[PDB]
Write an enzyme that holds these catalytic residues in place. Structure first.
Site, PDB file in Angstrom:
ATOM      1  CG  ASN A  83      -1.813  -1.208   1.291  1.00 21.14           C
ATOM      2  OD1 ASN A  83      -1.803  -1.942   2.282  1.00 21.14           O
ATOM      3  ND2 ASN A  83      -2.574  -1.447   0.240  1.00 21.14           N
ATOM      4  CG  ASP A 101      -0.449   2.800   4.541  1.00 26.15           C
ATOM      5  OD1 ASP A 101       0.136   1.778   4.132  1.00 26.15           O
ATOM      6  OD2 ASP A 101      -1.543   2.734   5.137  1.00 26.15           O
ATOM      7  CB  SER A 156       0.441  -1.065   5.602  1.00 22.75           C
ATOM      8  OG  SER A 156      -0.553  -0.613   4.693  1.00 22.75           O
TER       9      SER A 156
END
Ligand SMILES: [Cl-]
Ligand SMILES: [Cl-]
Ligand SMILES: [Cl-]
Ligand code: NA
Length: 129
Positions: A46, A48, A50
């Site tokens: 992802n 971000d 993660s």
């Protein structure tokens, strides 16, 4: 392991997902199809930082520890690698905690956008369950 559609339905039913928190089995099979294409080894990073893991694409910011997501919470108390196993027990047990968190299956973006409001019973049609 890449599951067949009916094979995964049978495994999810045996692990107690059918009508879990009111979500019929077809919902769970539909979510797995569009999250992972039924592949237990699927991973996706992802923006971000993660990563999502396994047949139900469980995210490392909240639910499992992968050693590289700073400030992550590890709410299912498992290494994220355990979610890639051919045995779906760990993924199912963690998914039960996610779906009980207040937002139901809306936690899975693919379920919300591709399964919610459709004839999800089609995903288990023909299966010996
Ligand atoms: Cl169903
Ligand atoms: Cl998740
Ligand atoms: Cl709900
Ligand atoms: Na984490």
């Amino acid at each position: 392991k890449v599951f067949g559609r009916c094979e995964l339905a049978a495994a999810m039913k045996r692990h107690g997902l059918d009508n879990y928190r009111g979500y019929s089995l077809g919902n769970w099979v539909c979510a797995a199809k569009f999250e992972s294409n039924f592949n237990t080894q699927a991973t996706n990073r992802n923006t971000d930082g993660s990563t999502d893991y396994g047949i139900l694409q469980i995210n490392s910011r909240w639910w499992c520890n992968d050693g590289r997501t700073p400030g992550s919470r590890n709410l299912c108390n498992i290494p994220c690698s355990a979610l890639l196993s051919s045995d779906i027990t760990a993924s199912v047990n963690c998914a039960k905690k996610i779906v009980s968190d207040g937002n139901g299956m809306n936690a899975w973006v693919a379920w919300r956008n591709r399964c919610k409001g459709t004839d999800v019973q089609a995903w288990i049609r023909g299966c010996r369950l």
